Design an enzyme around this catalytic site. Structure first.
Site, short mmCIF file in Angstrom:
data_model
loop_
_atom_site.label_atom_id
_atom_site.label_comp_id
_atom_site.label_asym_id
_atom_site.label_seq_id
_atom_site.Cartn_x
_atom_site.Cartn_y
_atom_site.Cartn_z
N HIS A 5 0.81 -1.23 0.00
CA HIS A 5 0.00 0.00 0.00
C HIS A 5 0.84 1.28 0.00
O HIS A 5 0.45 2.28 -0.59
CB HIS A 5 -0.95 0.05 1.22
N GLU A 77 3.60 -2.28 7.19
CA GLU A 77 4.41 -2.08 5.98
C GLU A 77 5.71 -1.27 6.28
O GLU A 77 6.74 -1.56 5.75
CB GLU A 77 3.56 -1.51 4.85
N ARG A 165 -21.23 10.53 21.48
CA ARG A 165 -21.78 11.75 20.89
C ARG A 165 -23.22 11.52 20.47
O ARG A 165 -23.53 10.50 19.79
CB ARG A 165 -20.96 12.20 19.68
N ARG A 220 -15.05 17.48 26.25
CA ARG A 220 -16.36 16.88 26.16
C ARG A 220 -17.26 17.15 27.36
O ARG A 220 -18.46 16.88 27.28
CB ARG A 220 -16.23 15.37 25.95
CL LIG Z 1 -12.67 14.07 20.01
#
Ligand SMILES: [Cl-]
Ligand SMILES: [Cl-]
Ligand SMILES: [Cl-]
Ligand SMILES: [Cl-]
Lengths: 241, 249, 247, 240, 242, 241
Positions: A5, A77, A165, A220
């Site tokens: 990748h 990788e 959330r 938060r």
């Molecule tokens: Cl966050």
């Protein structure tokens, strides 16, 4: 390329054994330019990679994308090309009221709210950072006049319901995660992010060193939606000296 | 007493806020006597407790017994009496081939092969030691000229099948644990013991500091149980006292 | 010694195939002394062991410590020395309102709120006592004029949160155990203790017989911890059961 | 922007309610250009978005990145902007001998070898695609002269151990995944990929429609334009 | 009817508080006719019910069908009609070599290889039989001169892969069950059947008494595919009702 | 017999490769008689089996009993005799307000609230119906002027607590299922029944085709019998054409 990748070969890394792994491909060049001789390596999918030099030592800077799955590809990788140390620099939402926007958190270990960590070890295994690397992160913070918050992070496979959330299309959170933010608050968990449980479990089980520092962009306890990079570079210099 | 099992009152601790918590009640006196004015406090069940003074400050030394369940009682009851820091000193079986008998291991975090940790947090939570306390243990090792092994420990609710021992009555290990030692070996896990997952989970979730140092008594790549052939240096007990002094300075 | 923790050899047991296994090392001598010729064997860590004779038959009395982990060591090491039957005698907190302090509970099977039982069998396996040994316990109670409570016990790896005690430093119980006492009450579970799930699972899966009798020391519908207001012994019952089994 | 990651506003979508969601940001333009008036919208992180018009109706084309976590952000944020239908077009590794290079797989449902799906429903819930959208994918395949393989896909949070790959630094696969490829082969599972369990579980539980069509790029036991042409054809069927 | 599935009313039971619950609807009449005044009550779906009288007291005999789900309906609906004691009589495959075809097993507790038990209690709860009822089953065996095997039974939601049978269309068993019969053998488990984990968990948690006796029809140490248990369950009921 | 429970041999099926599998043995004859030349095969336990001919093609009609366990026996034993397609026609309770009595539900996939599905695959595997068979069921509905509800069903090992029913002796629902009906309602689940998770998981993993159709006769939030059985026969004809 010699990996599936990333589009890299071992020769492109100039002997680097340490990577700085931000989530955002757009942050890679910025980090690289904090070091010397920043050199573009490759960009494919969410994986943008640069080489730079930290006090004369080669360092790869490679984005992981958001989440454990894309992270797991990049880490493997890079390890195929000789990298054995992975320093994540990220962004994070704090869940403790004493942590301010702009603060720095050094994650010692993570609550495994991810799937990819289970592809490296069963749940009982701790998603713990490497002690030496965590120590270097803490020292780099203190050298810069920053006392970091050091502790446990909740590392989630979602930004929305797994971080409890509710300002979403449906406004629902499935039973497993309903009430979960308060549970983690009460257990002293500092913050949420989305890569460290995978990173830490994969590196600990595979014999690589990992650590994580993140800048706090939201608290938060206030709202759902609102340098760490200088510290990660300084930590890399300590580890490669 | 002020607590239901330990036989202690808060006054007996003379203001101690740091405990050294060996597994073995019989080890308590020796640890205490490395400090000043060691005094027997109590002995009930697996819980033997002493007080001593480290550079002038009171330290409680209290055994936990083997296993998370008996540990969980000692930690909670000591915390009810004002203890907020718990330094475990133990013994351990190494599972990596060049972790020698007599070496010391500082456990930074544990594989939760216990039940009691689940009584404090779901399995996803990491059984991780306090950083400052772990740092003090590492520094104490290095001051004494021993580079410790620092890493992950498998912390089991059994000595026999959960540590994949086969020299038992039945010689069987249930499917969950068959092949498990190799899995932990392959993952770089250093050792087995029986208290640190519970200790670390309970302390991290309840706001207390914990750490763990242990001396290696057998290497499982060679023996299930040590015998008189096993190798016979710097003690984990001297290290944990030195770490306590650093934390209290 | 020929076992790693208990400090015992086979010879020291004088042929005993049955053990009485209290949790508390300090109770061992007292139990031994209800039998004849009580003899100290060893004491290391939480493992105190005596030999005594029950109507002429040798019985080992060995403490387990609190919890499945320390129990699992004592049972395996005793079995290495020829013990095949393990009669636990304990203390317990009742969770049904009319199971009085001082009553006796014979545990037929346990809710596996422990980790060590999983080191012997996956969770689907029942933590069930041996039928003959339970029967002997029940008969012993009735010989003494005690009707025991017979039923299911919740066997927990903690004393505090796993038994939904809240008078603790933090006063919190993690989500798994919040509301759990009521769940067990509603299901008819009689009591809490801390060793029987491990004991029963390990013995059933390894071919040994186990049973468990316990005295009630508190009723959780009234008190978290007994005190001086709180109101035939389980130890006399376990000795009588051992005699029935060895006759 | 109206959403936190994608850099889009609702007005930018011109009323689009259907999204084509490839994993690779670098594939977005190519899909958009198969439709009319393709217009670059935004690029942030792994999320490149374009608008185009399919028989006169607006369609958003937005990459997800690799994995359920980054996919879950894109799907939620597109839904906040009014998208209710999500057609994945991806690449995949086949694990059945009869599934040849050049064939097409329409995933009806997925083995949940991911973590993000659990953030929407417990594991008992099926990671199933929308029937109407799956039907449109199948019809589009058949219009192109392709009989698709229709069945179950293993949707893994890793490329390496979760797909039981041993060509890695350590060469180790944790016990959970040791022998797992043969288990899925024996259960008729067609292929591995890395987003559909999350996509399908989140959409089913939140009331949105999802489907997935992918080109087989390797067969573990032994086209690119086709799969993208098919998804555009399916979108047109759904929008007609 | 007073219940959703069985087609029974409380009056039809004439005050019965004890049920004998075979798996097979076609076994109900035979069992009933071992008692007095056997009377057909109803037959709907897998639920055939009779009443009979054991030393003067009414007993309901009602089939459960195979498996925990259908069992869970029969037990609940019988309990809605006043039944508080459920004596299962079954058939079973032994997995220990010392248990012979024709022997009887009294199940004291079960390995919960079912789903319905989880609809009554989480897995940690033991699927244990009532002590008094198990005691009566053992006594009935001994009265009949049979020393029963008393122990743990593996109670499976399938006959084929969950009992690790390989003589099937695919010949495969999913990873969870591959190797499992040997695991149970090593843990001393006696036998497999398909209803007791559900029965025992539901009864223990709901305040009802349950026990189980079964006749051994195959020994799995010899082959996958190949009565006095019925006389014994009737004798046990009489003891409990005396 | 060739099979231990059903009492059937392969010859008795006259080459049938498709079975209609109702739960109730008493419904078998009624289904069979919607086809031609209905022929009793066997009856043992809850397993009554008939053969009949649908547009000239042999079809087995065999009851399963209630629940995954008894279903799993019937499906395996019929597959041992050459049956490879299993069409369930059942009864169901709806849990969405918009699903009216008289409506039809075609179950595309199921919430695995059963045990027997786990005896065929771990929980991560989807309990999904065969696409071609589901498609035939939907077409059969529409041929009869019915637009079915097509979606997810909750497939429970119990009628009572696992469907969050409180109309029971104890009135109690264990914690796992407390609040569960609302959780499934919010996820768009249409209804409860008791066999489809087992049927679908076993068939998908063993290489057989399964589908499920049901008439709605009651709704937990608030002729059809003839319709659901006519539909399944019509679907069988589409599949055997
Ligand atoms: Cl966050
Ligand atoms: Cl050891
Ligand atoms: Cl208690
Ligand atoms: Cl059988």
């Amino acid at each position: 390329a010699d990996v599936f990748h990333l589009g890299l070969t071992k020769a492109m890394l100039d002997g680097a054994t340490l990577a700085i792994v931000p989530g955002d491909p757009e942050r890679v060049k910025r980090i690289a330019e904090l070091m010397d001789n920043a050199t573009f390596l490759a960009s494919h999918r969410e994986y943008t990679s640069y080489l730079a030099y930290a006090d004369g030592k080669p360092v790869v800077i490679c984005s992981t994308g958001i989440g454990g799955p894309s992270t797991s590809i990049a880490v493997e990788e890079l390890a195929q090309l000789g990298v054995n140390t992975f320093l994540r620099v990220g962004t994070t939402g704090a869940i403790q009221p004493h942590v301010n926007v702009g603060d720095v958190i050094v994650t010692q270990a993570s609550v495994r709210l991810d799937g990819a960590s289970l592809h490296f070890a069963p749940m009982e295994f701790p998603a713990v950072a490497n002690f030496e690397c965590t120590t270097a992160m803490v020292a780099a913070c203190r050298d810069a006049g920053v006392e970091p918050h050091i502790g446990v992070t909740a590392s989630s496979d979602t930004f929305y319901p797994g971080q409890e959330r509710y300002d979403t299309v449906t406004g629902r959170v499935t039973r497993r995660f309903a009430g979960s933010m308060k549970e983690w608050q009460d257990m002293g968990v500092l913050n949420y992010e989305m890569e460290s449980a995978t990173l830490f479990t994969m590196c600990a089980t595979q014999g690589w060193r990992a650590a994580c520092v993140a800048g706090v962009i939201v608290n938060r306890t206030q709202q759902e939606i609102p340098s760490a990079v200088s510290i990660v570079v300084a930590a890399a210099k300590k580890l490669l000296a």
